[PDB]
Amino acid sequence: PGIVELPTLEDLKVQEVKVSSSVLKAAAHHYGAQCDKPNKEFMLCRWEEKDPRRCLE
């Protein structure tokens, strides 16, 4: 049926956001106000491509 193509471990690396959920909840409203553009671009890619491998960047 074919080989499933997967990204390497190198290009799956990123600087993680290492704050707990309470910190995120406390910052969430301003975070959604300020970082709207990249988040919306990513989520549009996500619901259009229907593939996590196509929206890594």
Q: Based on CB atoms, which residue is closest to other proteins, 6 or 22?
A: 6
Whole-angstrom distance, CA of residue 5 vs CA of residue 2 = 9
Q: Give yes or no for residue 40 binding other proteins (CB under 8 A).
A: no
Phi/psi of residue 34, nearest 5 degrees = -90, -45
Q: Based on CB atoms, which residue is closest to other proteins, 41 or 49?
A: 49
Q: Give yes or no for residue 51 binding other proteins (CB under 8 A).
A: yes
Residue 10: name the closest of 50, 56, 43 by CA: 56
Q: Based on CB atoms, which residue is closest to other proteins, 36 or 49?
A: 49
